[PDB]
Write a protein that binds this DNA or RNA. Sequence first.
RNA 1: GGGGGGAACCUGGGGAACUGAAACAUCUCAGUACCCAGAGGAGAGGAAAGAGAAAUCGACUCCCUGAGUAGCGGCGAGCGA
RNA 2: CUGUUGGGAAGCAGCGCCAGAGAGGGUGAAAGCCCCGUAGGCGAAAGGUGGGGGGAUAGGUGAGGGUACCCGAGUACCCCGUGGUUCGUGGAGCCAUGGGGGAAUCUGGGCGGACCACCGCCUAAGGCUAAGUACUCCGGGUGACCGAUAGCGCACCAGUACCGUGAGGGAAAGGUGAAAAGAACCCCGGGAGGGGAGUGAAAUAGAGCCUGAAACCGUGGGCUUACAAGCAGUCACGGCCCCGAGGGGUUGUGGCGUGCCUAUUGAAGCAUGAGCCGGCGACUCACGGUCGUGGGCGAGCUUAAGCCGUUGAGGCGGAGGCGUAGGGAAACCGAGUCCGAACAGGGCGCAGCGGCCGCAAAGUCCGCGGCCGUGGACCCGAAACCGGGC
RNA 3: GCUGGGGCUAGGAGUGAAAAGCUAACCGAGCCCGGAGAUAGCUGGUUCUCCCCGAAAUGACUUUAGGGUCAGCCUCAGGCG
RNA 4: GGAUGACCCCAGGCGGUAGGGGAGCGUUCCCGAUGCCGAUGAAGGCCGACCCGCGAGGGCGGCUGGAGGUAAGGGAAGUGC
RNA 5: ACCCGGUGAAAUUGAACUGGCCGUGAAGAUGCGGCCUACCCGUGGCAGGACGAAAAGACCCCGUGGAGCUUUACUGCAGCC
Lengths: 64, 49, 14, 149, 107
Amino acid sequence: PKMKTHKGAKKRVKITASGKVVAMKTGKRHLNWQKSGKEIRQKGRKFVLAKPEAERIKLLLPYE
Amino acid sequence: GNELVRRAARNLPWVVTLAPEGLNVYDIVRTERLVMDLDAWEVFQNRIG
Amino acid sequence: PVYIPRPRPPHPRL
Amino acid sequence: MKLSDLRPNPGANKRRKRVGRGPGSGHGKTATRGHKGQKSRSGGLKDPRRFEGGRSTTLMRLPKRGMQGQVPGEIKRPRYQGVNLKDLARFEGEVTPELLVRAGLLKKGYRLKILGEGEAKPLKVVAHAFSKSALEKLKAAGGEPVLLE
Amino acid sequence: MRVKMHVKKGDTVLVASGKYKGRVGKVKEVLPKKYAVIVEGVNIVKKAVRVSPKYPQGGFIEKEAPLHASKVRPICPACGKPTRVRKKFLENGKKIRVCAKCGGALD
RNA sequence: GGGGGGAACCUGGGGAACUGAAACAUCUCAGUACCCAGAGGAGAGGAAAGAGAAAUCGACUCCCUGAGUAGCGGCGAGCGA
RNA sequence: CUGUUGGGAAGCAGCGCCAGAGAGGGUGAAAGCCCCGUAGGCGAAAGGUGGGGGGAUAGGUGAGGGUACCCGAGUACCCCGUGGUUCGUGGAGCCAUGGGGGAAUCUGGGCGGACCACCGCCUAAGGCUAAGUACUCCGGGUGACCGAUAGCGCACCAGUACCGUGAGGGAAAGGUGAAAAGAACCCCGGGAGGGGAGUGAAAUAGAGCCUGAAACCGUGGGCUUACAAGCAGUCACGGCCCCGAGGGGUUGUGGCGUGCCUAUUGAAGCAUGAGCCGGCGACUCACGGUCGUGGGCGAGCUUAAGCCGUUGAGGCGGAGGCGUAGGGAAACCGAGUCCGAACAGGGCGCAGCGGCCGCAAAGUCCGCGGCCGUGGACCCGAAACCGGGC
RNA sequence: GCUGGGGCUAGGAGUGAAAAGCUAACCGAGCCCGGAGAUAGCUGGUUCUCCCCGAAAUGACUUUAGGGUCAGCCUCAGGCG
RNA sequence: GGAUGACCCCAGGCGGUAGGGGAGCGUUCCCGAUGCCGAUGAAGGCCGACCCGCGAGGGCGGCUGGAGGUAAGGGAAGUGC
RNA sequence: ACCCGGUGAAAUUGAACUGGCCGUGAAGAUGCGGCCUACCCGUGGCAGGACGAAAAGACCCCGUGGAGCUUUACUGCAGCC
Ligand SMILES: [Mg+2]
Ligand SMILES: [Mg+2]
Ligand SMILES: [Mg+2]
Ligand SMILES: [Mg+2]
Ligand SMILES: [Mg+2]
Ligand SMILES: [Mg+2]
Ligand SMILES: [Mg+2]
Ligand SMILES: [Mg+2]
Ligand SMILES: [Mg+2]
Ligand SMILES: [Mg+2]
Ligand SMILES: [Mg+2]
Ligand SMILES: [Mg+2]
Ligand SMILES: [Mg+2]
Ligand SMILES: [Mg+2]
Ligand SMILES: [Mg+2]
Ligand SMILES: [Mg+2]
Ligand SMILES: [Mg+2]
Ligand SMILES: [Mg+2]
Ligand SMILES: [Mg+2]
Ligand SMILES: [Mg+2]
Ligand SMILES: [Mg+2]
Ligand SMILES: [Mg+2]
Ligand SMILES: [Mg+2]
Ligand SMILES: [Mg+2]
Ligand SMILES: [Mg+2]
Ligand SMILES: [Mg+2]
Ligand SMILES: [Mg+2]
Ligand SMILES: [Mg+2]
Ligand SMILES: [Mg+2]
Ligand SMILES: [Mg+2]
Ligand SMILES: [Mg+2]
Ligand SMILES: [Mg+2]
Ligand SMILES: [Mg+2]
Ligand SMILES: [Mg+2]
Ligand SMILES: [Mg+2]
Ligand SMILES: [Mg+2]
Ligand SMILES: [Mg+2]
Ligand SMILES: [Mg+2]
Ligand SMILES: [Mg+2]
Ligand SMILES: [Mg+2]
Ligand SMILES: [Mg+2]
Ligand SMILES: [Mg+2]
Ligand SMILES: [Mg+2]
Ligand SMILES: [Mg+2]
Ligand SMILES: [Mg+2]
Ligand SMILES: [Mg+2]
Ligand SMILES: [Mg+2]
Ligand SMILES: [Mg+2]
Ligand SMILES: [Mg+2]
Ligand SMILES: [Mg+2]
Ligand SMILES: [Mg+2]
Ligand SMILES: [Mg+2]
Ligand SMILES: [Mg+2]
Ligand SMILES: [Mg+2]
Ligand SMILES: [Mg+2]
Ligand SMILES: [Mg+2]
Ligand SMILES: [Mg+2]
Ligand SMILES: [Mg+2]
Ligand SMILES: [Mg+2]
Ligand SMILES: [Mg+2]
Ligand SMILES: [Mg+2]
Ligand SMILES: [Mg+2]
Ligand SMILES: [Mg+2]
Ligand SMILES: [Mg+2]
Ligand SMILES: [Mg+2]
Ligand SMILES: [Mg+2]
Ligand SMILES: [Mg+2]
Ligand SMILES: [Mg+2]
Ligand SMILES: [Mg+2]
Ligand SMILES: [Mg+2]
Ligand SMILES: [Mg+2]
Ligand SMILES: [Mg+2]
Ligand SMILES: [Mg+2]
Ligand SMILES: [Mg+2]
Ligand SMILES: [Mg+2]
Ligand SMILES: [Mg+2]
Ligand SMILES: [Mg+2]
Ligand SMILES: [Mg+2]
Ligand SMILES: [Mg+2]
Ligand SMILES: [Mg+2]
Ligand SMILES: [Mg+2]
Ligand SMILES: [Mg+2]
Ligand SMILES: [Mg+2]
Ligand SMILES: [Mg+2]
Ligand SMILES: [Mg+2]
Ligand SMILES: [Mg+2]
Ligand SMILES: [Mg+2]
Ligand SMILES: [Mg+2]
Ligand SMILES: [Mg+2]
Ligand SMILES: [Mg+2]
Ligand SMILES: [Mg+2]
Ligand SMILES: [Mg+2]
Ligand SMILES: [Mg+2]
Ligand SMILES: [Mg+2]
Ligand SMILES: [Mg+2]
Ligand SMILES: [Mg+2]
Ligand SMILES: [Mg+2]
Ligand SMILES: [Mg+2]
Ligand SMILES: [Mg+2]
Ligand SMILES: [Mg+2]
Ligand SMILES: [Mg+2]
Ligand SMILES: [Mg+2]
Ligand SMILES: [Mg+2]
Ligand SMILES: [Mg+2]
Ligand SMILES: [Mg+2]
Ligand SMILES: [Mg+2]
Ligand SMILES: [Mg+2]
Ligand SMILES: [Mg+2]
Ligand SMILES: [Mg+2]
Ligand SMILES: [Mg+2]
Ligand SMILES: [Mg+2]
Ligand SMILES: [Mg+2]
Ligand SMILES: [Mg+2]
Ligand SMILES: [Mg+2]
Ligand SMILES: [Mg+2]
Ligand SMILES: [Mg+2]
Ligand SMILES: [Mg+2]
Ligand SMILES: [Mg+2]
Ligand SMILES: [Mg+2]
Ligand SMILES: [Mg+2]
Ligand SMILES: [Mg+2]
Ligand SMILES: [Mg+2]
Ligand SMILES: [Mg+2]
Ligand SMILES: [Mg+2]
Ligand SMILES: [Mg+2]
Ligand SMILES: [Mg+2]
Ligand SMILES: [Mg+2]
Ligand SMILES: [Mg+2]
Ligand SMILES: [Mg+2]
Ligand SMILES: [Mg+2]
Ligand SMILES: [Mg+2]
Ligand SMILES: [Mg+2]
Ligand SMILES: [Mg+2]
Ligand SMILES: [Mg+2]
Ligand SMILES: [Mg+2]
Ligand SMILES: [Mg+2]
Ligand SMILES: [Mg+2]
Ligand SMILES: [Mg+2]
Ligand SMILES: [Mg+2]
Ligand SMILES: [Mg+2]
Ligand SMILES: [Mg+2]
Ligand SMILES: [Mg+2]
Ligand SMILES: [Mg+2]
Ligand SMILES: [Mg+2]
Ligand SMILES: [Mg+2]
Ligand SMILES: [Mg+2]
Ligand SMILES: [Mg+2]
Ligand SMILES: [Mg+2]
Ligand SMILES: [Mg+2]
Ligand SMILES: [Mg+2]
Ligand SMILES: [Mg+2]
Ligand SMILES: [Mg+2]
Ligand SMILES: [Mg+2]
Ligand SMILES: [Mg+2]
Ligand SMILES: [Mg+2]
Ligand SMILES: [Mg+2]
Ligand SMILES: [Mg+2]
Ligand SMILES: [Mg+2]
Ligand SMILES: [Mg+2]
Ligand SMILES: [Mg+2]
Ligand SMILES: [Mg+2]
Ligand SMILES: [Mg+2]
Ligand SMILES: [Mg+2]
Ligand SMILES: [Mg+2]
Ligand SMILES: [Mg+2]
Ligand SMILES: [Mg+2]
Ligand SMILES: [Mg+2]
Ligand SMILES: [Mg+2]
Ligand SMILES: [Mg+2]
Ligand SMILES: [Mg+2]
Ligand SMILES: [Mg+2]
Ligand SMILES: [Mg+2]
Ligand SMILES: [Mg+2]
Ligand SMILES: [Mg+2]
Ligand SMILES: [Mg+2]
Ligand SMILES: [Mg+2]
Ligand SMILES: [Mg+2]
Ligand SMILES: [Mg+2]
Ligand SMILES: [Mg+2]
Ligand SMILES: [Mg+2]
Ligand SMILES: [Mg+2]
Ligand SMILES: [Mg+2]
Ligand SMILES: [Mg+2]
Ligand SMILES: [Mg+2]
Ligand SMILES: [Mg+2]
Ligand SMILES: [Mg+2]
Ligand SMILES: [Mg+2]
Ligand SMILES: [Mg+2]
Ligand SMILES: [Mg+2]
Ligand SMILES: [Mg+2]
Ligand SMILES: [Mg+2]
Ligand SMILES: [Mg+2]
Ligand SMILES: [Mg+2]
Ligand SMILES: [Mg+2]
Ligand SMILES: [Mg+2]
Ligand SMILES: [Mg+2]
Ligand SMILES: [Mg+2]
Ligand SMILES: [Mg+2]
Ligand SMILES: [Mg+2]
Ligand SMILES: [Mg+2]
Ligand SMILES: [Mg+2]
Ligand SMILES: [Mg+2]
Ligand SMILES: [Mg+2]
Ligand SMILES: [Mg+2]
Ligand SMILES: [Mg+2]
Ligand SMILES: [Mg+2]
Ligand SMILES: [Mg+2]
Ligand SMILES: [Mg+2]
Ligand SMILES: [Mg+2]
Ligand SMILES: [Mg+2]
Ligand SMILES: [Mg+2]
Ligand SMILES: [Mg+2]
Ligand SMILES: [Mg+2]
Ligand SMILES: [Mg+2]
Ligand SMILES: [Mg+2]
Ligand SMILES: [Mg+2]
Ligand SMILES: [Mg+2]
Ligand SMILES: [Mg+2]
Ligand SMILES: [Mg+2]
Ligand SMILES: [Mg+2]
Ligand SMILES: [Mg+2]
Ligand SMILES: [Mg+2]
Ligand SMILES: [Mg+2]
Ligand SMILES: [Mg+2]
Ligand SMILES: [Mg+2]
Ligand SMILES: [Zn+2]
């Protein structure tokens, strides 16, 4: 039958107009008191996934 | 479209018979020459417009 | 042959 | 042109890759599968899009973000699809959302908004919304924006 | 329901093919289950017979072999030719076989 | 009048496990397999105490589409209007 | 219809003819015209049907004004326990209801995802209703379906023989020939079998029957071998036999030489499988995806289910899908947008070749190929777990 | 005490002077048919020919260690030069 | 070189397991086919020291066999032990 | 048991034209090397080898395989309060 969108992927990731895959930084869910402002600031930003891993995630989102 | 004329020619081994509504390319290519009503030529002129 | 004679037991190699 | 003349172009009808049919084929015995893995077996591996050998997968270590939703699901609000002026360069007279659905421009069930990219033409354009740029361009080119509802 | 026999016992038929093509003879017998007929004087064969009552001295006797009923064509008792059988109805309402060449009846 | 039978099909009452989750328990398999009762040439359903936002539609069944959408989910595997 | 080869004509030859019929199967080989059929027509006393045409019956039918009489009860409704829904306790409604409590009759009541208000929708607690839908024991039609190890387990006296206490398991086995003309009679023999005779176009087509492969067994002939060391071959030369400046068969001597497959760092290996032969035997299909590719169209491309037509004819159908705009959790903004106080900075975004026409192309549709996902998903193999039976 | 005939008790069940004995010639959970083509990261096997190229047995992570994901190393198409 | 396999010349590459890629052969079936090969002998079988092809194969001839077979060009697979 | 007459199996079996020593070899060779020995084929006997046959090693390990059994392992259910 037709494929199903993986819902972990859709809920974590976004495919950009040229086909890149972008995700929130990791590291600021907790244990943040002793972390630099530079570290909390830099991780507030999105980041492009490495190409081998992005092309895997894209196969999980066949209807975007 | 002449039912009488198709009935006359259906049995000739060298004749495929056809109504204009059924003009296909397999039967055209299957055969060496083509013969059409001017009524049916109008029908072919519509279907490729 | 629906009856198979059971195999002899192996020499104990312990 | 007779039936002995009907021919596919070169490359239209490639042959298939029959495996496990002999030494000469280059594909015999192991059927191009190599030796003795889970991947060699009928049923192969888990989904190689996700499975990473038992470790936490690269996808599941990334955090989620945003509103995912909750029962009873999507909230019905008006949806807005945009159309740039350059797209309108083909029409004369009046533009309406109804007129643009048939052009293959504005999908059904979407409110029409005109956008700036392009060049305004002296048209009557009826639409649910206009950007600041498209509005400005349109007045200047003699066209009449008509904000409907 | 029934096997269709263009020919019947007793009428004269021509054998149109085989070794005996050209022969003419009365239909001695019709075997519907085998789609065949026995024609007088046609298709003779040699049957060995054991020494027995009704056959002392033994040896061989000549019997007539069957012909596929398709190799037989009735000879029109009027015009005298072989013909296919038509079906003509009568004023009685009944239906008889009739010659195709001329219009005669064959019964 | 009933009783019993009928290859699949149908409705109701009950209702697994292997398996999948590369372990497993919630979850999956699946209201499937199967047991039972009933029905008929079909069975079910059916004429709004409906839908759900159109200041709308207008019984029910079925097909296409909506849509792998909305959602659901040890937010896992998956499930899925 | 005739002639001709032939056991046999339908083959071949000469001259015709039909065709609303040149689908197909037979007939001694290959037939429009020999047979059965086919096109096109016709047909029911009796039984079944009859959804269509007709008739009949049951049945159906207005206002204003007043009155507030009735409008489905252990029900609604609330709570407890659960089920159904995409909804797994979740903000958890709706629908159902096992337990407790327990109303009203339209100023009644339920619903629109806790709740409340407003605005609306609908009238629970009785029942019935064709069609469009599913299936295939049964009849028929048609196959880029099988052709006797295949196709149903069964082409055949098969759910049999046989196996099992039983539930249950479950086979193998088709073909003489055109016609039995199925071989009188004689000879050897107890018979079986054979040898003659005879039939047949053909009898190593003789019923233990079409074709008749291979393993395997044997008779006859050529070459060869009893001082020789071997994965059996190969290279060379010589001898002998055969076929007719060459070739084939055989092998005496000399040289060289560690089976096949599998698994392995590594096998001739004293590691695995195989007695030998014949047949069966393992990477596919569907739908989705992702590249590549042959075409069509191109800011567009494309239809699904259905409807009409055909009876191996194609057409219609634009519902919908992909694409034409991105950015943001979103409100929203938009060639920009988000973070930010910012006009800061950054993240993700945005912009053909020829001479108005031609070639091209975003895209998209179809075909094809490779690979992926869901399915048993390359084939064979457990020990086990569950259900109902015996 | 031994024995004939007639009966009853069975599958997580029976019966057992107890051996996990026996329950139709293999019982630490009978037999059949079914779920079913369970699942098998394991072993085996995988069939015509020619041509070009041609690896790896490492690193990281892994209830991972004889299995995998990514990189490394091979091959094909297109582009650069 | 000639002008885009139309053949020739010169030079270089051409061991190969896992594996990537290319080009071919053969099997069954469909169109081609109301055709054409066929009893003056179909397919199948048995020989061959002969012809073509690198090969897989294909011819041709003789014996057997006795009624089918099927081209150039394409199409689809239960396709080679 | 042996010989003659009658009837006549089996497991096993890559093929076999199947010698010794000292070496060599995946580490225990009829099969490789160098020597030595040896005319061809049996019958009755013996078991040292063919890592002889039989049984896809019970031991041992491995498998995120199974099953029985235990308990102050986890989590439930019957039962009982
Ligand atoms: Mg998730
Ligand atoms: Mg996102
Ligand atoms: Mg936080
Ligand atoms: Mg610090
Ligand atoms: Mg700081
Ligand atoms: Mg800080
Ligand atoms: Mg910040
Ligand atoms: Mg979509
Ligand atoms: Mg015709
Ligand atoms: Mg015709
Ligand atoms: Mg024709
Ligand atoms: Mg056995
Ligand atoms: Mg044994
Ligand atoms: Mg193909
Ligand atoms: Mg290929
Ligand atoms: Mg092939
Ligand atoms: Mg091969
Ligand atoms: Mg290879
Ligand atoms: Mg593969
Ligand atoms: Mg393998
Ligand atoms: Mg290996
Ligand atoms: Mg390997
Ligand atoms: Mg292997
Ligand atoms: Mg390995
Ligand atoms: Mg592998
Ligand atoms: Mg891999
Ligand atoms: Mg393999
Ligand atoms: Mg399997
Ligand atoms: Mg597997
Ligand atoms: Mg771990
Ligand atoms: Mg979160
Ligand atoms: Mg969303
Ligand atoms: Mg009468
Ligand atoms: Mg009944
Ligand atoms: Mg039910
Ligand atoms: Mg139960
Ligand atoms: Mg389970
Ligand atoms: Mg399963
Ligand atoms: Mg389990
Ligand atoms: Mg599991
Ligand atoms: Mg698992
Ligand atoms: Mg487990
Ligand atoms: Mg369920
Ligand atoms: Mg049920
Ligand atoms: Mg009943
Ligand atoms: Mg019906
Ligand atoms: Mg009904
Ligand atoms: Mg009802
Ligand atoms: Mg009502
Ligand atoms: Mg949970
Ligand atoms: Mg699920
Ligand atoms: Mg479910
Ligand atoms: Mg003659
Ligand atoms: Mg004639
Ligand atoms: Mg002629
Ligand atoms: Mg016809
Ligand atoms: Mg015909
Ligand atoms: Mg015919
Ligand atoms: Mg002919
Ligand atoms: Mg023929
Ligand atoms: Mg005919
Ligand atoms: Mg008719
Ligand atoms: Mg008729
Ligand atoms: Mg009242
Ligand atoms: Mg009421
Ligand atoms: Mg629930
Ligand atoms: Mg619930
Ligand atoms: Mg929740
Ligand atoms: Mg709920
Ligand atoms: Mg309520
Ligand atoms: Mg309720
Ligand atoms: Mg209740
Ligand atoms: Mg409740
Ligand atoms: Mg009210
Ligand atoms: Mg009220
Ligand atoms: Mg209610
Ligand atoms: Mg409410
Ligand atoms: Mg409502
Ligand atoms: Mg409502
Ligand atoms: Mg009612
Ligand atoms: Mg009903
Ligand atoms: Mg109905
Ligand atoms: Mg039928
Ligand atoms: Mg039938
Ligand atoms: Mg056939
Ligand atoms: Mg057979
Ligand atoms: Mg059979
Ligand atoms: Mg046969
Ligand atoms: Mg076979
Ligand atoms: Mg077969
Ligand atoms: Mg059979
Ligand atoms: Mg049958
Ligand atoms: Mg029998
Ligand atoms: Mg029986
Ligand atoms: Mg018995
Ligand atoms: Mg019995
Ligand atoms: Mg016969
Ligand atoms: Mg016969
Ligand atoms: Mg004959
Ligand atoms: Mg007979
Ligand atoms: Mg005598
Ligand atoms: Mg005799
Ligand atoms: Mg004799
Ligand atoms: Mg005799
Ligand atoms: Mg002859
Ligand atoms: Mg012969
Ligand atoms: Mg013969
Ligand atoms: Mg025959
Ligand atoms: Mg024979
Ligand atoms: Mg024989
Ligand atoms: Mg023979
Ligand atoms: Mg001899
Ligand atoms: Mg000597
Ligand atoms: Mg000598
Ligand atoms: Mg040697
Ligand atoms: Mg020499
Ligand atoms: Mg010579
Ligand atoms: Mg020689
Ligand atoms: Mg030699
Ligand atoms: Mg080999
Ligand atoms: Mg091994
Ligand atoms: Mg080993
Ligand atoms: Mg050896
Ligand atoms: Mg060996
Ligand atoms: Mg050996
Ligand atoms: Mg061993
Ligand atoms: Mg091994
Ligand atoms: Mg092996
Ligand atoms: Mg054996
Ligand atoms: Mg042998
Ligand atoms: Mg074989
Ligand atoms: Mg494949
Ligand atoms: Mg398939
Ligand atoms: Mg594809
Ligand atoms: Mg494509
Ligand atoms: Mg197109
Ligand atoms: Mg173009
Ligand atoms: Mg279109
Ligand atoms: Mg802000
Ligand atoms: Mg910016
Ligand atoms: Mg930028
Ligand atoms: Mg294209
Ligand atoms: Mg792939
Ligand atoms: Mg499946
Ligand atoms: Mg499969
Ligand atoms: Mg696959
Ligand atoms: Mg068992
Ligand atoms: Mg369980
Ligand atoms: Mg059970
Ligand atoms: Mg039970
Ligand atoms: Mg007693
Ligand atoms: Mg007693
Ligand atoms: Mg008793
Ligand atoms: Mg008892
Ligand atoms: Mg009992
Ligand atoms: Mg019982
Ligand atoms: Mg049990
Ligand atoms: Mg159990
Ligand atoms: Mg017990
Ligand atoms: Mg006792
Ligand atoms: Mg038993
Ligand atoms: Mg026992
Ligand atoms: Mg057990
Ligand atoms: Mg037992
Ligand atoms: Mg059963
Ligand atoms: Mg299952
Ligand atoms: Mg399976
Ligand atoms: Mg398992
Ligand atoms: Mg190389
Ligand atoms: Mg390593
Ligand atoms: Mg493993
Ligand atoms: Mg890799
Ligand atoms: Mg490199
Ligand atoms: Mg690459
Ligand atoms: Mg090269
Ligand atoms: Mg090479
Ligand atoms: Mg081929
Ligand atoms: Mg074609
Ligand atoms: Mg044809
Ligand atoms: Mg001819
Ligand atoms: Mg002849
Ligand atoms: Mg001949
Ligand atoms: Mg052939
Ligand atoms: Mg054939
Ligand atoms: Mg040949
Ligand atoms: Mg031949
Ligand atoms: Mg024929
Ligand atoms: Mg053909
Ligand atoms: Mg071809
Ligand atoms: Mg196959
Ligand atoms: Mg003696
Ligand atoms: Mg003896
Ligand atoms: Mg005897
Ligand atoms: Mg034996
Ligand atoms: Mg050998
Ligand atoms: Mg040898
Ligand atoms: Mg020797
Ligand atoms: Mg050593
Ligand atoms: Mg050494
Ligand atoms: Mg040694
Ligand atoms: Mg030796
Ligand atoms: Mg050797
Ligand atoms: Mg050597
Ligand atoms: Mg030696
Ligand atoms: Mg030596
Ligand atoms: Mg010596
Ligand atoms: Mg001896
Ligand atoms: Mg010994
Ligand atoms: Mg020994
Ligand atoms: Mg020994
Ligand atoms: Mg041994
Ligand atoms: Mg052994
Ligand atoms: Mg095994
Ligand atoms: Mg083992
Ligand atoms: Mg064992
Ligand atoms: Mg033991
Ligand atoms: Mg060990
Ligand atoms: Mg173990
Ligand atoms: Mg573990
Ligand atoms: Mg593991
Ligand atoms: Mg375990
Ligand atoms: Mg257990
Ligand atoms: Mg158990
Ligand atoms: Mg258990
Ligand atoms: Mg107690
Ligand atoms: Zn006449």
